[PDB]
Write a protein that binds this ligand. Structure first.
Ligand SMILES: [Cu+2]
Ligand SMILES: [Cu+2]
Length: 513
């Protein structure tokens, strides 16, 4: 029962999800696409001669930048009614991420479609950028046109590229950005709403670890990387969201909240799904998120495999192409970049984040072990303060052979909260440092976090979610592979006043091959 986008030009409604303040929304909620009386045709693979090479936004040639600027300028010049227009392209994101469509074609007209918070996250945005990229190319007669990508997994590429800065005369410019972050400032891939008073050196090191954390530590298998299973009939109210992937809830979300203008009602443009598409950097951010998918597989680590579930493969969306034709595309058809005739320009060397595993904790920095166990704790627990609890592990002292067959994964389920605002809390495991020990935002005890852009549903006031954290490296890094219990510490960062956690448990997840 795969999620199937309906006739988007026939069945559509104004965005009513993930927008905390609709009264005063600076951008429109009328995200329905133009009706040009076109029939939805099946997708056909491109016959391009050369492969479109996407370039780092901070290492672009004069031609690459000018072509990109001229292309956006052309897109901004089109009428709003045009499917290829700047406004229309932005509305695509709004329609799919803020309840524009329903699962009516699958027989559930009372259930909205949400590409986010699911395994549809990566493939959707790949198709999104795919048509977006080919549209820009055709508007300037560049058959070999290629988008840039925000290479924030590389130090010199972490600050916003200056090509997006300046003033309104620049097509790539957007006034609706965080003023405190547009001054050549380094991005925080683990942003929680408040700037950190740490050196640039520390921030880069933590950014590199965040990439490693999202692609290696927590991206241990397809479920934890792409996101949870999401089939037709699935409602966010009955019951909750498909667990969110490591990238989506991690570095991806961080950039959205870091770029978005906090002075605006819904943190427009980037800070919210419904308005993100109005900022040119949005597509360039997702160009690298799209690249994380590529890198995640090129690591060729165990468990880093493609999805084979037919419910994923047969899931489909609808887009307008450069010829204003309605095209239905399937997830199965975007797994191969060679077939889509594009790729990314890499440094010919080793990725700077490849070895950004947190440093081993010294036993001399740790003390011996009073925290209650799950059996002693009354759930659900509310995270309006730091919460500590000991969780029984599924095993202890696993051999190297055992760890290569299954991941020890911490599962935090039934996370209920008002999704009208941005939510984030951090997760630390086996924290037992002595007093006076120096700490960093990228310590080994840090398992990562659960961050959520507002995506509150139309007919519920509360959304439910799930997070997955890999412990194979962490337990080693903390010298606690032998301990029967794992002390899990949940630290709220923002929007956790009403947040509650329903269940916490550690399980062995077999590595798929
Ligand atoms: Cu999105
Ligand atoms: Cu995004």
């Amino acid at each position: 029962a795969p999620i199937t986008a309906p006739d988007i030009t026939s069945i559509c409604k104004d965005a009513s999800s993930g927008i905390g303040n609709q009264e005063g929304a600076i951008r429109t909620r009328k995200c329905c696409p133009p009706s040009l009386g076109k029939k939805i045709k099946d997708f056909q693979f491109p016959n391009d001669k050369k492969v479109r090479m996407r370039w780092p936004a901070h290492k672009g040639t004069k031609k690459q930048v000018d072509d990109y600027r001229r292309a956006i300028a052309a897109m901004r010049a089109l009428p709003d009614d045009d499917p290829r227009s700047f406004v229309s392209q932005a509305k695509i994101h709004c329609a799919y991420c803020n309840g524009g469509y329903t699962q009516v074609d699958s027989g559930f007209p009372d259930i909205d479609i949400q590409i986010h918070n699911s395994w549809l996250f990566f493939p959707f945005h790949r198709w999104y950028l795919y048509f977006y990229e080919r549209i820009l190319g055709s508007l300037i007669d560049e058959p070999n046109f290629a988008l840039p990508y925000w290479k924030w997994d590389e130090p010199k590429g972490m600050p916003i590229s200056n090509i997006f800065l300046g003033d309104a005369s620049n097509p790539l410019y957007d006034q609706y950005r965080d003023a405190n972050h547009i001054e050549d400032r380094i991005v925080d891939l683990d942003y929680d709403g408040k700037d950190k008073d740490i050196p640039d050196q520390q921030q880069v090191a933590c950014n590199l670890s965040t990439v490693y954390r999202d692609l290696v530590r927590n991206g241990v298998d397809p479920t934890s990387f792409f996101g949870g299973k999401y089939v037709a009939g699935d409602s966010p109210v009955a019951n909750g969201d498909p667990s969110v992937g490591s990238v989506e809830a991690g570095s991806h979300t961080a950039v959205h909240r870091w770029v978005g203008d906090p002075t605006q009602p819904n943190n427009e443009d980037m800070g919210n799904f419904y308005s993100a598409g109005y900022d040119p950097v949005f597509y360039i951010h997702h160009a690298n998120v799209d690249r994380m998918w590529k890198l995640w597989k090129e690591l060729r680590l165990p468990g880093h495999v493609d999805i084979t579930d037919p419910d994923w493969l047969n899931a489909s969306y609808v887009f307008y192409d450069e010829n204003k034709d309605l095209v239905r595309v399937y997830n199965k058809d975007c797994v191969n970049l060679d077939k889509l005739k594009y790729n990314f320009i890499e440094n010919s060397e080793v990725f700077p984040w490849r070895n950004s595993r947190p440093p081993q904790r010294r036993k001399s920095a740790q003390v011996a072990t009073d925290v209650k166990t799950v059996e002693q704790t009354k759930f659900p627990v509310r995270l309006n303060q730091i919460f500590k609890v000991r969780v029984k592990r599924p095993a202890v002292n696993r051999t190297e052979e055992e760890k290569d067959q299954a991941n020890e994964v911490l599962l935090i389920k039934k996370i209920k909260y008002d999704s009208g605002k941005f939510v984030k809390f951090d997760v630390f495991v086996n924290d037992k440092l002595k007093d006076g020990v120096f700490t960093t935002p990228c310590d080994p005890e840090y398992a990562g976090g659960f961050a959520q852009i507002p995506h509150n549903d139309k007919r519920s006031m509360v959304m439910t979610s799930t997070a997955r954290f890999g412990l194979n490296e962490l337990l080693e890094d903390t010298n606690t592979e032998g301990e029967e219990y794992a002390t899990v510490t949940l630290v709220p960062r923002t929007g956790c006043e009403d947040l509650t956690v329903g269940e916490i448990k550690i399980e062995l997840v077999p590595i798929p091959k």
